[PDB]
């Protein structure tokens, strides 16, 4: 339940 | 100047009139010519 707020996929 | 007033639950204004001389002198030398001289003292404009 932690949003890194970063699209690691792409 | 320091004024002391009763408190009011609303914004108000302290209105001060500074008594002076507010005068004009009118000159009419020629046809269709009006020249004026204003003088306000104290508190000149």
């Amino acid at each position: 339940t932690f949003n890194p707020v970063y699209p690691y996929d792409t | 100047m320091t004024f002391e007033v009763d408190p009011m639950d609303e914004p108000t204004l302290l209105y001060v009139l500074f008594e002076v001389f507010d005068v004009v002198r009118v000159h009419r030398p020629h046809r269709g010519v009006i020249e004026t001289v204003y003088l306000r003292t104290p508190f000149s404009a």
Partner: protein, 440 residues
């Protein structure tokens, strides 16, 4: 009749030159120290013997029998940053969502608050400045938003630069292309219900190119509520429509990859809750909308051509109505000049072909964190970026009256609009050339 005498040297006649300059090796050592190139002392003496200070005793005397004046040209050079604290371009208040909660059994409690984000001085270019702003909105969400409910889906306030309305079809009620046409037209600010931005204490407003049609009324606040008519329309469900070939069409894409909601007002409407300034301006009611009290203007990174005033308290007579004082922030003024900063313009068709490549170039999608959401996406870079650029200014003031007795040490002072030294001055110096004007 018109001499010019000094201590014990041959008298000179008609004119000459006194030089006001900071550099001098001697005076820097002694005199100024705790000063800077905007408030310093300097000896006008220029005679190799004599200890500065002891110089201060001497004086240049312009013949007493005549009223003198001197031409004053100056060389000013700064290097002030596009975005910095002193000029008021590193801060800006905006209202964002703080908490999203499940309350008192059935209520959805939304709590919004104003907060002032700051930027890291320097970072020129307009586009990038926008980005740094958007990023600051985020950086805040990272410290408060998420950890209090509020999803990305409902991030209030984002500065973009496109015309969410190019695709738009007057019948469909949707942006047919299924994508908000990715080209940059002008900066604008987008808001979600309940939030908004305030520039009351910031020149960045001028950077976005949005000004009040009535400047002097201190108070630049642009609420969501203000952006009436002109909520970003929604996207056509390009996939559904096509595959479906009735026709789906009415289907207005509700989310996106990684499923973020485009906050649509209702299960029906083609409009989203996202309101855009740029839209309200030219797409909303001209008589009551925002176009009524704000003006769409050319960007300009400098944030606003400001002027600086010079003063040579100990050498020129005090201009008409100024009174002589010793309060650095009230010295008489003898010359005004625009603060040395220009807007150089370039062409980067590489923009958005570059945002596309820029993202791989920069090892991170730091600014584009939401590469799917057609809104929260990273605004397109506009062709033609602007950049504040510092330039030496060889200005020229007119002849000004002089005192007939010029002190050995003169005080030079460059002030700004609000009257305060300006830290960003690297070089200031002037040349004065006295000459007769009439006699006593």
């Amino acid at each position: 009749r018109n001499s010019i005498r000094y201590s014990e040297l041959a008298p000179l006649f008609d004119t000459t030159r006194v030089y006001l300059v900071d550099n001098k090796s001697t005076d820097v050592a002694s005199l100024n120290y705790q000063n800077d190139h905007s408030n310093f002392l300097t000896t006008v003496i220029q005679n190799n013997d004599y200890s500065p200070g002891e110089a201060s005793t001497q004086t240049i005397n312009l013949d007493d029998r005549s009223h003198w004046g001197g031409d004053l040209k100056t060389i000013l050079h700064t290097n002030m940053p596009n975005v910095n604290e002193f000029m008021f371009t590193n801060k800006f208040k905006a209202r964002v969502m703080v908490s999203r909660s499940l309350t008192k059994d059935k209520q959805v409690e939304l709590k919004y608050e104003w907060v002032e984000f700051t930027l890291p001085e320097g970072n020129y270019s307009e586009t990038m400045t926008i980005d740094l702003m958007n990023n600051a909105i985020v950086e805040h969400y990272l410290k408060v938003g998420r950890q209090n409910g509020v999803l990305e889906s409902d991030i209030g306030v984002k500065f973009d630069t496109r015309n969410f309305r190019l695709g738009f079809d007057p019948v469909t009620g949707l942006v047919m292309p299924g994508v908000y046409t990715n080209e940059a037209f002008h900066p604008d600010i987008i808001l979600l219900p309940g939030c908004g931005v305030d520039f009351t204490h910031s020149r960045l407003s001028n950077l976005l190119g949005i000004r009040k049609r009535q400047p002097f009324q201190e108070g630049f606040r642009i609420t969501y509520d203000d952006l009436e008519g002109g909520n970003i329309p929604a996207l056509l469900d390009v996939d559904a429509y096509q595959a479906s070939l009735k026709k789906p069409v009415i289907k207005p894409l509700t989310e996106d990859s990684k499923k973020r909601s485009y906050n649509l007002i209702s299960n029906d409407s083609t409009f989203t809750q996202y309101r855009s300034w740029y839209l309200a301006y030219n797409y909303g009611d001209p008589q009551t909308g925002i176009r009524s009290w704000t003006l769409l203007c050319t960007p300009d990174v400098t944030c606003g051509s400001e002027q600086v005033y010079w003063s040579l308290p100990d050498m020129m007579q005090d201009p008409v109505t100024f009174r002589s004082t010793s309060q650095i922030s009230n010295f008489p003024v003898v010359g005004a000049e625009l603060l040395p900063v220009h807007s150089k313009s370039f062409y980067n068709d590489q923009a958005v072909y570059s945002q596309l490549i820029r993202q791989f170039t920069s090892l991170t999608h730091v600014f584009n964190r939401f590469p799917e959401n057609q809104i929260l996406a990273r605004p397109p870079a506009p062709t033609i970026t602007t950049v504040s650029e510092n330039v030496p200014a060889l200005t020229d003031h007119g002849t000004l009256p002089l005192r007939n007795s010029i002190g050995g040490v003169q005080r030079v002072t460059i002030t700004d609009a609000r009257r305060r030294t300006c830290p960003y001055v690297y070089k200031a110096l002037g040349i004065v050339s006295p000459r007769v004007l009439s006699s006593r």
